[PDB]
Design a protein around this ligand. Structure first.
Ligand SMILES: [Zn+2]
Lengths: 26, 92, 184, 131, 124, 181
RNA sequence: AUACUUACCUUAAGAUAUCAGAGGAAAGUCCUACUGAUCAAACAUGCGCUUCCAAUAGUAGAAGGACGUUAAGCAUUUAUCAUUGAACUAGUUCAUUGAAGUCAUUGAUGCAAACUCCUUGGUCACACACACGGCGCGGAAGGCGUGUUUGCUGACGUUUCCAUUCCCUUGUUUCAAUCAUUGGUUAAUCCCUUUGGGUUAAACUGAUUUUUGGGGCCCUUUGUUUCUUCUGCCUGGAGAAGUUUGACACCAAAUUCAAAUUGGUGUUAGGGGAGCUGGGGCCUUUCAAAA
């Protein structure tokens, strides 16, 4: 009973340009 | 007899009843005696004509019971062992 | 007479409703019996069906039609391997038994009627029973009266954001590698 | 007078085996019911549309093939072009049938009515086949 | 169909699928397991069959096909008062020889239990 | 998916693969035969792999959709319930309901669309905000004018402001050609 | 598991086949591994006893189901009571007040079909065989009969008690080659008393064993032979250890912190041969009685 059936997904960050910025307005 | 002992083994589990009047009482079995009269808890009732109600507590006379439905997993329960080995009874 | 309790295998002398009722409710008898049905229940899943095989004489047609079809390779794990993988599979079934996704109860936590429904002790249908279901508690809360007037604004640095959806351990490499936006 | 092949051998009771065989030939026939079965004596019909009697032995030589007799030869053939070389199947198997090399024995009782010597000859040549 | 032993009592027959008739005109078909002095018996997987009031006119004297409404109820315990007569439907999943085998192995295992308990109690 | 994979794992015979899909699609798409006669065991072990691959693909698509929907919208929504007519909702939550509704409209699934409007409607019912939009998507995209009238009528009850709803409602009734109403 | 405290409570009765006869301590009782009859159980064992046990010379079929679909199938019949007011014929509609009110009307009842899917079986051997209605090996379920033992049956304890075994195999089957072992037949040579016996090497034949090759069927054995554990396998069917006062697997706990601890459930299997032993049928010999 060490490993488990399910995990929370971990995912990479996309470098933070002005296109992937969720706060961008202009 | 075994048939009554199985009813005693069904205490605290959801069971079904059929009274000879035609009704159906399905709910959780609190008490049972060797006279087969049982009392059930939080039970759903079906009148002989189908009208269904709900009552919190019920006591029924064993003479009026027709069949009792018991959770299936009691089938393999130790009461049904044919060849069984008991120890010696204590001396009193 | 004498009442033999075959779960505990121990006799009790001169059966009476009081003494028998006390034994059946007893903690030791409880553990013994519960474990007994745990075994008798795990057996039907453990027991292999082992249904009987009936082999008929293969006809001349299907032996020729099946001879041109190439023979497929079979994979057979080592004993040391198959013991471990059986352990893992069984422990996975035990996991899928206990899952019971409750997330709805996590969503409505701050609803005005949350105390009358999801607390399940103070309900109507199941409410009165839980009291008698409380153990004898021998030795050694969320009241229903709550209103909307408490916690008027559900967000003041109170809530945790919703937990991410789970993922299979096997296929965990299937996930898109990078997110679309920049989270903090 | 007609001859079969590769019939089921397994039912061991002639009146039950003729039940099964008759059942495959004619569904909703006289006898799906089973109070009784008719037994014409040597020298009445089993089923309508040509059937008269059924014959099965247990011998290892005759094992799988059971013979049928009919009212007349043109109805005996009429049963054969009923299916017209489209094989019917009894319990598990399609049967391959043909005209019997020896004439129907109960048909000889009808022919000569239209037979003690044959019964003498059968006892004699049977006595010799025992040898 | 099935031939029951010419002399066989309710004790001889266990695990046979039975057919039980009550006073109300309904039937409980299933495996018998236990019974009692006053003949209330325990059926394993049982189905109560009933002839509706509407199909009943079809049984009065003149091939009949009755629609018998039935519902499945597992592991019941009947009451001897209601039971009327009992008939045998089928014979058990196991033959007689095989049941002798499992009976003997079960008895041997039962003795082994008594020895393992006695010698676990004696020394400690 | 764990129940599905397990139930695939517990299949002991070829005959039980017809439970998944019919006999023809298995022989055509995955090229596996149920009537196959021979040594079956390794053939069925091959068939479980070929059946688990496509389930892994379905897992690819559906995982993608779920992770998008959570990572963008559902993670931003902290209140799924009604509260009261005196409740206020945060601005970011409004914005994520709006964009979540536009996304749902884009999926073009009508059941899930009406669901996500009614789902979005109980958290904020009193603004008139989602009432107007839920009249707009149904008046133009689906082109259903009566449904829009009925949306605005049910919006008259919950919404406190009522002015925009009753103006747009005057217009909807004008175009519907009901003058007595 | 042990010690202490507190609570709950204690023995329906009798018997273990019947009948009859003889004996022991006029009436009755008890008793006789005493004698007969009948009954019952277990164990054996037989019957030309009865019924049943699925296609591969083919893509089937038999029994039983679906708490399965078509399917809002087709054809029918049903959806509360009381009080007051308005209109109305001489019962009907609308509104208000009260009481209870299984859900269903895609329902319920009747009628029928098609399709699909589940469980089960010796899917055995020999045979593709012109008969007047058998006498292949097994399994299941019965009926009838003889024989033995016992007189409800089982755990527990005691004894100058009596007891007391092995081997091979766990894909299977068949053929061929070669090796080894044993037996029978024929030819030649030598020795002893035309005949008989022994030995020799050689030839043929049957049975058994070792190594290889070929073929057949099976591998769902799905945790790749399921009697365990460990090693291991599809270009393979394997190897090592072990087998009931024991071992193994598994379930449950709380801690320690991956072992064990305590409490429970289950497995320890199948096949063949040798030995020993019980029963049955047949043959030969010996004995007793009767005609
Ligand atoms: Zn107990």
């Amino acid at each position: 009973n060490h490993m488990s059936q399910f995990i929370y997904p971990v995912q990479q960050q996309p470098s933070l340009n002005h296109f992937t910025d969720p706060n961008n307005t202009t | 007899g075994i048939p009554v002992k199985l009813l005693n083994e069904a205490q605290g589990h959801i069971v079904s009843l059929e009274l000879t009047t035609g009704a159906t009482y399905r709910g959780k079995l609190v008490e049972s005696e060797d006279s087969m009269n049982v009392q059930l808890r939080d039970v759903i009732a079906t009148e002989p004509q189908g009208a269904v109600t709900h009552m919190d507590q019920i006591f029924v006379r064993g003479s009026q019971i027709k069949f009792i439905v018991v959770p299936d997993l009691l089938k393999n329960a130790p009461l049904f062992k044919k060849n069984s080995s008991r120890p010696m009874p204590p001396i009193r | 007479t004498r009442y033999y309790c075959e779960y505990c295998h121990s006799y009790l002398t001169h059966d009476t409703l009081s003494v028998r009722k006390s034994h059946l409710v007893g903690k030791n008898h409880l553990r013994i019996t519960a474990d007994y049905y745990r075994n008798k229940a795990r057996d039907i899943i453990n027991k292999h069906n082992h249904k009987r095989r009936h082999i008929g004489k293969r006809g001349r047609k299907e032996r020729e039609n099946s001879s041109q079809n190439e023979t497929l390779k079979v994979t057979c794990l080592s004993n040391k391997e198959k013991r471990h993988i059986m352990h893992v599979k069984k422990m996975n079934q035990k996991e899928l038994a206990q899952t019971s996704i409750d997330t709805l109860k996590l969503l409505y936590d701050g609803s005005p009627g949350y105390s009358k429904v999801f607390v399940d002790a103070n309900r109507f249908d199941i409410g009165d029973l839980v009291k008698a279901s409380k153990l004898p508690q021998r030795a050694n809360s969320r009241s229903r009266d709550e209103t909307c007037e408490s916690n008027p604004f559900p967000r003041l640095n109170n809530p945790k954001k919703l937990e991410p959806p789970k993922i299979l351990s096997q296929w965990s490499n299937t996930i898109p590698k990078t997110s679309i936006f920049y989270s903090v | 007078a007609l001859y079969f092949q590769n019939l089921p051998s397994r039912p061991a009771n002639k009146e039950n085996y003729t039940r099964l065989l008759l059942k495959h030939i004619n569904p909703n026939n006289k006898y799906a019911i089973n109070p009784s079965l008719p037994l014409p004596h040597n020298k009445l019909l089993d089923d309508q549309m040509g059937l008269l009697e059924v014959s099965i032995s247990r011998s290892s030589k005759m094992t799988n093939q059971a013979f049928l007799t009919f009212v007349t030869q043109e109805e005996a053939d009429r049963f054969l072009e009923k299916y017209t070389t489209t094989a019917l199947k009894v319990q598990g198997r399609k049967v391959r049938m043909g005209k019997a090399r020896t004439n129907s024995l109960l048909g000889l009782s009808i022919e000569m009515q239209k037979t003690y010597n044959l019964d003498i000859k059968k006892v004699l040549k049977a006595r010799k086949l025992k040898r | 169909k099935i031939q029951v032993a010419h002399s066989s009592r309710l004790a001889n027959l266990i695990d046979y699928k039975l057919r039980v008739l009550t006073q109300d005109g309904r039937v409980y078909i299933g495996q018998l397991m236990a019974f009692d002095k006053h003949m209330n018996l325990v059926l394993n997987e049982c189905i109560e069959e009933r002839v509706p009031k509407t199909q009943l006119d079809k049984l009065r004297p003149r091939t009949l096909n009755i629609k018998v409404e039935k519902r499945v109820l597992g592991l019941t315990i009947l009451r001897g008062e209601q039971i009327l007569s009992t008939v045998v439907e089928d014979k058990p999943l196991l033959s007689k020889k095989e049941r002798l085998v499992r009976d003997k192995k079960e008895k041997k295992q039962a003795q082994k239990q008594t020895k393992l308990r006695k010698e676990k109690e004696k020394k400690p | 998916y764990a129940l599905w994979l397990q139930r695939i794992d517990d299949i002991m015979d070829l005959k039980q693969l017809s439970q998944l899909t019919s006999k023809d699609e298995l022989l055509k798409k995955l090229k596996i035969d149920i009537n196959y006669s021979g040594r079956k065991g390794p053939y069925l072990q091959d068939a479980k792999k070929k059946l688990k691959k496509i389930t892994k693909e379905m897992y690819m698509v559906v995982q993608y959709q779920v992770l998008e929907i959570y990572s963008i919208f559902e993670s931003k929504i902290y209140i799924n319930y009604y509260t009261s007519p005196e409740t206020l909702v945060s601005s970011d939550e409004i914005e994520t309901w709006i964009k979540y509704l536009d996304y749902t409209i884009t999926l073009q699934t009508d059941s899930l669309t009406h669901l996500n409007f009614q789902r979005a409607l109980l958290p904020l019912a009193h603004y008139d905000l989602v009432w107007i939009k839920y009249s707009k998507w149904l008046i133009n995209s689906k082109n259903d004018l009566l449904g829009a009238k009925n949306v605005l009528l049910m919006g008259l009850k919950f919404s406190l402001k009522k002015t925009e709803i009753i103006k747009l409602l005057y217009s909807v009734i004008c175009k519907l050609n009901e003058y007595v109403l």
